[PDB]
């Protein structure tokens, strides 16, 4: 015989609605908030840190220019 | 006698640091500019998303 | 004598060269990671545009 489904009572089509209710709204909110928090945390902090890097490398590179000048005064005698 | 040999050693070595310095500067500026590009394109989208959030 | 003024700078050069190589390598790695992230953002936007494209 085919699989004789045993005699129960119910149910269906409430589960699909239940599954959709969470995803459509709460998942949307938490996902968009995760996007926002990730953007805010990463982009601004790292761009500020990298402009800090740019100014520090400017300082170090100018210091090395001065080192080159003094080295070519003490060397080219 | 290590005099001339070590002098050549220093002569070859010290220029390499300067060779790497300019490359580091160029690549750091490239990375920083690209990160700026991403953040510029990302802020508009995230702001529209904040507008998108429940109208 | 004349050897020490050369040995000092010679050893000055080695660690500096290694540190510069490490820094440029790590910066390049960060740059490539950011490039992949940027391409991914473009991919997400373009996939949205291509999927919706009016229905």
UniProtKB/Swiss-Prot annotation, chain A:
Basic and acidic residues compositional bias, start-end: 38-77
Disulfide bonds: none
Source organism, top-level taxon: Eukaryota
Signal peptide: none
Job of this protein: Troponin T is the tropomyosin-binding subunit of troponin, the thin filament regulatory complex which confers calcium-sensitivity to striated muscle actomyosin ATPase activity.
Family statement drawn from the similarity comment of this UniProt entry: Belongs to the troponin T family.
Record's protein name: Troponin T, cardiac muscle
Residues of the full protein shown: 88 to 164 of 301
From Swiss-Prot, chains B, C:
PTM comment text: Phosphorylated at Ser-54 by DAPK1 in response to oxidative stress and this phosphorylation enhances stress fiber formation in endothelial cells.
Primary gene name: Tpm1
Interval of the full protein contained in this chain: 230 to 284 of 284
Free-text note on domains in this protein's UniProt record: The molecule is in a coiled coil structure that is formed by 2 polypeptide chains. The sequence exhibits a prominent seven-residues periodicity.
Induction profile: Induced in stimulated quiescent cells.
Complex and partners: Homodimer. Heterodimer of an alpha (TPM1, TPM3 or TPM4) and a beta (TPM2) chain. Interacts with HRG (via the HRR domain); the interaction contributes to the antiangiogenic properties of the histidine/proline-rich region (HRR) of HRG. Interacts (via N-terminus) with LMOD2 (via N-terminus) and TMOD1 (via N-terminus).
Source organism per UniProt: Mus musculus
Cellular localization per UniProt: Cytoplasm, Cytoskeleton
Full protein name: Tropomyosin alpha-1 chain
Miscellaneous note of the record: The sequences of cardiac and skeletal muscles are identical.
Residue numbers bearing the Phosphotyrosine modification: 32
Top-level taxon: Eukaryota
Family according to the record: Belongs to the tropomyosin family.
Protein task: Binds to actin filaments in muscle and non-muscle cells. Plays a central role, in association with the troponin complex, in the calcium dependent regulation of vertebrate striated muscle contraction. Smooth muscle contraction is regulated by interaction with caldesmon. In non-muscle cells is implicated in stabilizing cytoskeleton actin filaments.
Modified-residue entries (Phosphoserine), positions: 23, 42, 54
């Amino acid at each position: 015989v085919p699989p004789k489904i045993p005699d129960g009572e119910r149910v269906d089509f409430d589960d699909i609605h239940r599954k959709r209710v969470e995803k459509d709204l709460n998942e949307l909110q938490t996902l968009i908030e995760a996007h926002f928090e990730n953007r805010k945390k990463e982009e601004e902090e790292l761009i500020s840190l990298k402009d800090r890097i740019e100014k520090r490398r400017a300082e170090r590179a100018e210091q090395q220019r001065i080192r080159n000048e003094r080295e070519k005064e003490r060397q080219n005698r | 006698d290590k005099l001339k040999e070590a002098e050549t050693r220093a002569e070859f070595a010290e220029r390499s640091v300067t060779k790497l310095e300019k490359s580091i500067d160029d690549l750091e500026d490239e990375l920083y500019a690209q990160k700026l590009k991403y953040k510029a394109i990302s802020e508009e989208l995230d702001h529209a998303l904040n507008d998108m959030t429940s109208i």
